[PDB]
Amino acid sequence: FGTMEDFENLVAAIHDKGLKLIIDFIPNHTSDKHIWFQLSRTRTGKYTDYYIWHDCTHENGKTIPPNNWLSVYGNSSWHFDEVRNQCYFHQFMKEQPDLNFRNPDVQEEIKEILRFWLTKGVDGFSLDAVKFLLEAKHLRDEIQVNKTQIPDTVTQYSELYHDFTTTQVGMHDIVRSFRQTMDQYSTEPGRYRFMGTEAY
Amino acid sequence: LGLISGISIIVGTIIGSGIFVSPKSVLSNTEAVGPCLIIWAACGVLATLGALCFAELGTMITKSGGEYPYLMEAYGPIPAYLFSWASLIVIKPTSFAIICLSFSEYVCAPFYVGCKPPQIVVKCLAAAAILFISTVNSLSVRLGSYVQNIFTAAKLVIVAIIIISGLVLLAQGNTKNFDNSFEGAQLSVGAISLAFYNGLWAYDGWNQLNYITEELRNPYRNLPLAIIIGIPLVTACYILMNVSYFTVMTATELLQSQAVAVTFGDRVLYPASWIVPLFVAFSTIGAANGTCFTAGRLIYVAGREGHMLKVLSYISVRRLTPAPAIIFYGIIATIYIIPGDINSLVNYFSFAAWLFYGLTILGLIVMRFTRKELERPIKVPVVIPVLMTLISVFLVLAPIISKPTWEYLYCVLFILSGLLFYFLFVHYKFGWAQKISKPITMHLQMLMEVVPPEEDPE
Ligand SMILES: CCCCCCCCCCCCCCCCCC(=O)OC[C@H](COP(=O)(O)O)OC(=O)CCCCCCCCCCCCCCCCC
Ligand SMILES: CCCCCCCCCCCCCCCCCC(=O)OC[C@H](COP(=O)(O)O)OC(=O)CCCCCCCCCCCCCCCCC
Ligand SMILES: *[C@@H]1O[C@H](CO)[C@@H](O[C@@H]2O[C@H](CO)[C@@H](O)[C@H](O)[C@H]2NC(C)=O)[C@H](O)[C@H]1NC(C)=O
Ligand SMILES: *[C@@H]1O[C@H](CO)[C@@H](O[C@@H]2O[C@H](CO)[C@@H](O)[C@H](O)[C@H]2NC(C)=O)[C@H](O)[C@H]1NC(C)=O
Ligand SMILES: NC(=[NH2+])NCCC[C@H](N)C(=O)O
Numbered sequence: 290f291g292t293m294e295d296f297e298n299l300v301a302a303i304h305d306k307g308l309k310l311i312i313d314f315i316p317n318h319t320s321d322k323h324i325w326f327q328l329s330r331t332r333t334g335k336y337t338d339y340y341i342w343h344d345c346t347h348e349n350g351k352t353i354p355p356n357n358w359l360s361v362y363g364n365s366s367w368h369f370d371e372v373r374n375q376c377y378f379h380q381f382m383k384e385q386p387d388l389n390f391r392n393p394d395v396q397e398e399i400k401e402i403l404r405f406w407l408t409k410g411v412d413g414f415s416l417d418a419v420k421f422l423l424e425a426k427h428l429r430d431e432i433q434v435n436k437t438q439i440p441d442t443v444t445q446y447s448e449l450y451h452d453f454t455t456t457q458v459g460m461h462d463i464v465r466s467f468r469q470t471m472d473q474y475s476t477e478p479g480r481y482r483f484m485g486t487e488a489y
Numbered sequence: 490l491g492l493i494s495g496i497s498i499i500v501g502t503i504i505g506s507g508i509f510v511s512p513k514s515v516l517s518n519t520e521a522v523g524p525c526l527i528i529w530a531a532c533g534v535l536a537t538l539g540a541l542c543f544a545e546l547g548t549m550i551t552k553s554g555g556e557y558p559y560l561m562e563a564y565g566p567i568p569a570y571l572f573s574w575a576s577l578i579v580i581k582p583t584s585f586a587i588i589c590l591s592f593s594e595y596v597c598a599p600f601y602v603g604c605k606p607p608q609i610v611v612k613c614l615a616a617a618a619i620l621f622i623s624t625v626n627s628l629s630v631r632l633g634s635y636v637q638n639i640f641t642a643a644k645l646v647i648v649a650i651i652i653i654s655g656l657v658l659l660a661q662g663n664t665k666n667f668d669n670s671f672e673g674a675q676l677s678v679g680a681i682s683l684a685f686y687n688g689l690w691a692y693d694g695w696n697q698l699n700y701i702t703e704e705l706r707n708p709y710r711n712l713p714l715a716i717i718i719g720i721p722l723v724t725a726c727y728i729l730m731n732v733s734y735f736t737v738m739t740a741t742e743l744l745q746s747q748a749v750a751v752t753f754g755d756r757v758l759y760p761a762s763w764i765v766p767l768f769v770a771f772s773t774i775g776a777a778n779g780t781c782f783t784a785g786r787l788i789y790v791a792g793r794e795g796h797m798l799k800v801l802s803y804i805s806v807r808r809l810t811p812a813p814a815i816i817f818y819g820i821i822a823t824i825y826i827i828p829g830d831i832n833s834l835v836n837y838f839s840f841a842a843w844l845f846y847g848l849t850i851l852g853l854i855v856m857r858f859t860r861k862e863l864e865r866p867i868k869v870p871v872v873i874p875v876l877m878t879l880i881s882v883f884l885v886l887a888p889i890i891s892k893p894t895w896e897y898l899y900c901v902l903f904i905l906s907g908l909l910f911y912f913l914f915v916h917y918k919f920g921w922a923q924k925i926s927k928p929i930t931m932h933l934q935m936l937m938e939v940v941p942p943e944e945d946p947e
């Protein structure tokens with residue numbers, strides 16, 4: 290798409306025509322090539338708890354996961370990492386590990402990203418996948434839609450009720466703290482910052 | 490008064506409400522940042538070359554008034570009569586209307602944060618300032634001058650805050666609005682001419698510099714030295730305030746802004762942003778309270794030649810104030826704000842003022858061929874009133890041949906309507922003329938308790 294100077298020339302050009310610019314923001318997960326995840330799986334410093342890791346019993350090339358939770362695109366939502374020798378959680382794909390939002394260091398890093406783009410002059414944000422932000426820490430199994438189905442065959446996302454992996458207690462308070470961070474850039478009149486959420 | 494304290498009256502009179510209102514319409518006509526700062530410097534040159542021409546006439550002739558004794562010595566009684574008529578109904582009430590409308594733009598704007606305040610609130614708060622200042626100055630002759638010292642003190646505090654905060658932010662590297670300063674401009678003689686109208690409104694007051702600054706320890710040296718120092722010091726403050734605006738604002742954000750200083754004070758002074766609508770509003774009614782002091786000085790000397798109604802410039806017996814002249818200026822100023830619109834009263838004021846600025850400066854060149862043997866202590870080089878005459882021809886003819894709007898027709902039709910009154914009341918002393926005027930003079934005298942001023946010329 291270009292460089293950072295191409296973005297800054299676009300933001301200035303949008304403002305000279307009287308337009309506003311909002312961008313997407315992805316708080317739920319990163320790539321597994323992010324620098325936080327490469328430090329997380331070697332247990333380096335504070336980054337050890339940036340992602341959700343749990344013990345598993347990977348043998349014969351196959352993983353026994355800690356529970357029955359499924360990915361949105363459909364298989365187990367736990368993936369074994371060979372360097373860490375633990376399993377990490379992902380809501381969408383195994384290349385997209387979920388951030389641990391019960392860690393307050395993670396919540397501080399998301400706020401610095403928001404301040405970065407608001408300083409560039411972005412007029413607002415669209416928040417993606419906010420209902421996936423928190424999961425239950427008790428790690429109990431979800432309820433099957435068909436209770437006589439054998440659990441070896443439960444692999445599709447629509448075969449479970451997602452009572453423990455979507456819309457947990459404390460999720461709306463994280464979205465409200467995002468609104469509080471953007472309120473420090475909204476005090477000047479005519480420069481209110483927009484926050485929209487996507488939950489489909 | 491010395492030299493250094495002579496600068497203080499020149500700066501304090503010129504710096505007013507103009508620098509808080511005019512930067513939007515100078516930029517709107519020359520649509521780049523680069524030519525906008527060239528215009529604010531070129532109006533500082535016109536204001537000092539114009540005030541040097543008035544300093545020569547003010548020590549040559551030595552009669553009080555304004556441009557009225559300068560026009561009488563050069564052309565006769567016809568353009569002298571037209572000046573006292575056009576300053577009675579056009580020049581002085583529109584100056585009072587622009588300032589009181591400029592006060593109301595700054596009181597209303599912090600209550601409409603991202604929004605535009607409706608015209609009924611701007612006009613009915615400006616009308617309440619015209620009536621309140623006309624009531625105070627018609628009752629309490631000493632009260633207007635005591636509060637003037639705290640209005641001048643509040644004026645140059647908010648000027649020093651804007652200039653210094655613009656130099657601090659420019660030091661930190663906020664120079665990205667001056668990058669390609671000359672891309673997108675107008676070489677149009679209607680857009681350049683209207684940027685000169687609004688730029689010279691903020692410099693207005695250079696022609697009233699003659700009389701109250703003759704009280705110096707050594708005139709004919711300290712008066713032309715107070716103009717070369719005093720007005721280019723104002724030009725240094727006006728360029729620095731406009732540079733201070735463009736460090737926090739784009740040229741697009743400055744056009745889409747109601748009051749340009751409340752936008753500055755919202756980005757720089759956040760937890761105390763209300764001090765900019767508080768000090769600018771104090772500085773603005775200080776500029777309107779100052780003009781009601783000298784109400785009647787030109788009225789008295791034009792009435793002495795029979796060129797003005799003498800019921801004006803009468804003095805109330807209780808509360809020794811020129812109450813007929815103050816009440817008359819308040820009525821015409823409230824009539825002017827109902828069609829209203831700063832950027833329409835500025836063009837209406839500037840067409841009439843610069844028609845008569847260029848007639849007295851041309852009268853300086855006439856009085857060198859017709860009026861020798863006349864003892865000139867201050868003497869300018871002859872090229873200074875020549876180019877100041879040709880620039881005044883450019884500021885009069887170019888708006889009506891490029892962008893002729895309807896306010897330039899009402900300004901001509903009000904000046905030449907005085908030319909009819911010259912031929913019915915001055916040139917031909919008809920019998921039915923003073924059968925009307927002295928009944929009005931006698932009945933207004935008992936209605937207001939106003940007497941002839943117990944005062945001869947000096
Ligand atoms: C629509 C277009 C046209 C609009 C015209 C509107 C005219 C409205 C006039 C309103 C006058 C308001 C005066 C009150 C101002 C008070 C200010 C103040 O503080 O005063 C202190 C001053 C102090 O007096 P003290 O209280 O006695 O000490 O108070 C007064 O002097 C009040 C006296 C009232 C003056 C009224 C003058 C009216 C003149 C009308 C004459 C018209 C003649 C026309 C003849 C035509 C012949 C062809
Ligand atoms: C307190 C405020 C009101 C007091 C001042 C106004 C007095 C009310 C009377 C108004 C005029 C009445 C008709 C004229 C009476 C005098 C005629 C005459 O023979 O003069 C002899 C007169 C000499 O009279 P003497 O003073 O008695 O010697 O000769 C002249 O002075 C010639 C100059 C005339 C100037 C006329 C000024 C008219 C002011 C009103 C203009 C109205 C339009 C305002 C602008 C449009 C709206 C934006
Ligand atoms: C996970 O889902 C994938 C679907 O992408 C399954 O992998 C293959 O799916 C294709 C159908 O598109 C079959 O033809 C292959 O036989 C599947 N592979 C295998 C090894 O069976 C996969 O079975 C699912 N389950 C797991 C545990 O990975
Ligand atoms: C899902 O639930 C159904 C019953 O709710 C389970 O049982 C099947 O029900 C159908 C009803 O028409 C019968 O025809 C089948 O014989 C039943 N038995 C089977 C398929 O073994 C069903 O087993 C559950 N699981 C799945 C994967 O369908
Ligand atoms: N005689 C007058 N008060 N004229 C108006 C002066 C305007 C002043 N120079 C300003 O900056 O707004």
Ligand SMILES: [Ca+2]
Pocket residue numbers: 317380387388421422423424
């Ligand atoms: Ca999550």
